[PDB]
Amino acid sequence: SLKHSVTQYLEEIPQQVQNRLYTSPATCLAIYRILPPLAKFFIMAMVFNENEVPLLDLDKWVNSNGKLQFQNAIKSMKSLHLLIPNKSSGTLMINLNPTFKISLRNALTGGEVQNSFGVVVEENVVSLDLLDEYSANKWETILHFMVGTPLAKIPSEKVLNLLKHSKLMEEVNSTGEFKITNEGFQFLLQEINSQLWTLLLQYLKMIETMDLVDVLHFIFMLGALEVGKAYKILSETQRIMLQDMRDYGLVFQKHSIFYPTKLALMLTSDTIPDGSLIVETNFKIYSYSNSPLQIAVLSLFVHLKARFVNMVLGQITRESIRRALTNGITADQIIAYLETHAHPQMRRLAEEKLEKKLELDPNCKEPLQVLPPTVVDQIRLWQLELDRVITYEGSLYSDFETSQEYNLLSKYAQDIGVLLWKDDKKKKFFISKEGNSQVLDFAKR
């Protein structure tokens, strides 16, 4: 999703801002890697040629089969203003952005880069001992607060405010606490790379007047830096934002010099299993997860009963699923988490059942199911219980002198999509509270 979500954010950026962004070669290289593979082919060809190339020739470059990919590639390039079209003498010529072209060329070859990539100090630090531990602790702490489980350490105020403003992990002052919404659980399910960009993108939106271009340049530059190998401390806005990243764990400072963190390398791009669990027809759960986070996240919708060093065992109960649904989690997410973390034994047994079913009747094909059907059905049914009775807020209109007026009002309410119930025999109809003002205004006129 990063290959698309990050692209969408860049497209929304104004053209003038995008042109400024292309100044730094490091950002250009990152923006080069996010484009579709076919876009990479065309862009690289145009980097080393300082001349206009007609669009027809680029079309000829592609085969008949891959016409659809070409259409997507050109649209993506045009969206980001990478390709500037020019119409003259009845010819449609396309050229690369001079700022992007020069910066990208400088990155590939040896040339002035205005120290965009930073400067090496030749002071390496063991990663498996300190940087990795520091990165895990910071990510472990922030995630623990998100899940809601108690933890003595508290995330910094700046990150706490961002989460409060952020849609995920909604906080209610009246309740006096912070709770996980549907988006919050989705964030937990998403991998580390998706989670990191999820927070980073929100921070970029929140920041107003720290220049946006400066922040984006540092973030893209951060990916270029490799684990360890501190670099000398760069705009003033970058320095303060660097401190913010340090609170997030993306960067480690000894107090002078900042060591890039492993998460920074993961930020560049992608790259029995831990966290897997077994679900029985008896509704028991046994998770082979020793990580403290895995136990906490499971406890959100599972009634934990005991734990060993090797694994944690619990059971799904009406209380556990009811609690999760009340928080805001959907039953679809609950099954998704259980299935993705299925134990290999469950997968092997499910495959055997599928093979036997196919042998009995290969004509009919059904999807492979890892979890037992009964457990999934019970969880879905429990969700249906919450929506057993539906309540709407609105007003009821009746006692109409003429049937024509009632019909016109009912038709108008339905058109604007605010009619909840109607009955011609009684000449009554109930509308939603949101549309009450609109209906009243229409009645007056």
Binding site: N51, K60, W61, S64, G110
Partner: protein, 386 residues
């Protein structure tokens, strides 16, 4: 197409299709092996038993007596279906399949009359089967090796069962039937269509079989395809590149100039356009010609290729006597050239030259091949003959 209007000899047509003809012949000239047909029939009060034409033929082949009974009664005594009902309800059927002959049952009045003939046939068959046996496995000599031995007679357990009256029980009769049936099957296999010494020798103690595969060592010395600087210069060049690399390497200079870059791009695009012109057209492919005309073109091409194949076969046969046949093939080949030209003229006046170009292109390669064959034949004929 190739023998009615073309006039090619019918015999010549099958010359190049021998393998197909042989396969078709063998699809009906092979028969299944002998087997105990009657033992497969199970009656399964009313009982339904099924028969098949192949089953009927097998019964006749294995048991001539049934065939002799059948042939007489085919139209004369009664219709065929009634025969099988009588036969399966008769004692002859029981005897043939080796079932013990129980006390006289209903059987069949007519079929039972052939029991004496069947017994006579069995005796004749037994006499035919009887023949001298290899002395290694002969058992008659073993019992007769001491003709004067008159030891104690063996108990009844070592003799065929007998009834109270002393008559034979009848089990030996069915046992002999099994032997006769097996011998009949094995002997029928051997149709018109020192040895013991080798078997007795123990093979495991003989010398192990040794492979005699050939070995070849090919010479890797082949002729080169057929339609220098001094050492000091190499050292100077090596030093120059060595000095240049160490001194300084500028990757920025790698960028080309404006004019040279345009020339390089133009050449690449030009080649791509030529290649792209081929890759767009690299179930039958759609044809612009009408279906009726296309089918006619297919017929003309198919017959033209057949003529060329036969002509080359005779031309390359390397036999002088083939000259007489070659002449006719050559004359037929020449006529096809006129037909191709005639068809083009018909298309010219039929389609108004609109489809003539398409039709000519479709049949161009075959026409080129045919004219080449005539030129090759004519050139060889001219010089060699006179």
């Amino acid at each position: 197409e190739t023998v009615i209007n073309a006039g090619l000899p019918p015999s010549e047509f099958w010359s190049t299709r021998i393998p197909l003809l042989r396969a078709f012949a063998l699809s009906t000239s092979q028969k299944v092996g002998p087997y105990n047909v009657l033992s497969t029939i199970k009656p399964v009060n009313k009982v339904n038993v099924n028969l098949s034409r192949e089953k009927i033929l097998n019964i006749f082949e294995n048991y001539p007596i049934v065939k002799k009974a059948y042939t007489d009664n085919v139209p004369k005594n009664f219709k065929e279906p009634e025969f099988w009902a009588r036969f399966f309800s008769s004692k002859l059927f029981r005897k043939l399949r080796g079932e013990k002959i129980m006390q006289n049952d209903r059987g069949d009045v007519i079929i039972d009359r052939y029991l004496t003939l069947d017994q006579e046939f069995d005796r004749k068959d037994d006499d035919m089967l009887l023949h001298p046996v290899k002395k290694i496995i002969d058992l008659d000599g073993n019992i007769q090796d001491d003709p004067v031995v008159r030891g104690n007679r063996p108990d009844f357990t070592m003799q065929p069962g007998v009834d109270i009256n002393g008559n034979s029980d009848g089990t030996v009769d069915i046992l002999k039937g099994m032997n006769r049936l097996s011998e009949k099957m094995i002997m029928a296999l051997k149709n018109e269509y020192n040895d013991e010494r080798n078997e007795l020798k123990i093979d495991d103690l003989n010398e192990s079989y040794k492979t005699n595969y050939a070995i070849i060592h090919l010479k890797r010395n082949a002729h080169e395809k057929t339609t220098k600087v001094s050492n000091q210069q190499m050292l100077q060049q090596l030093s120059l590149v060595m000095d240049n690399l160490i001194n300084k390497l500028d990757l920025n200079q790698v960028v080309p100039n404006n004019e040279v870059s345009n020339k390089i791009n133009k050449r690449v695009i030009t080649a791509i356009k030529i290649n792209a012109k081929q890759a767009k057209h690299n179930l039958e492919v759609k044809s612009t010609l009408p279906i009726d005309l296309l089918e006619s073109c297919r017929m003309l091409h198919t017959t033209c290729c057949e003529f060329l194949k036969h002509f080359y076969i005779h031309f390359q046969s390397g036999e002088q006597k083939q000259a007489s046949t070659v002449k006719k093939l050559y004359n037929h080949l020449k006529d096809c050239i006129e037909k191709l030209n005639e068809l083009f003229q018909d298309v010219l006046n039929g389609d108004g030259e609109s489809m003539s170009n398409t039709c000519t292109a479709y049949l161009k390669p075959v026409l080129n091949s045919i004219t080449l064959a005539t030129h090759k034949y004519d050139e060889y004929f001219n010089e060699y003959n006179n």
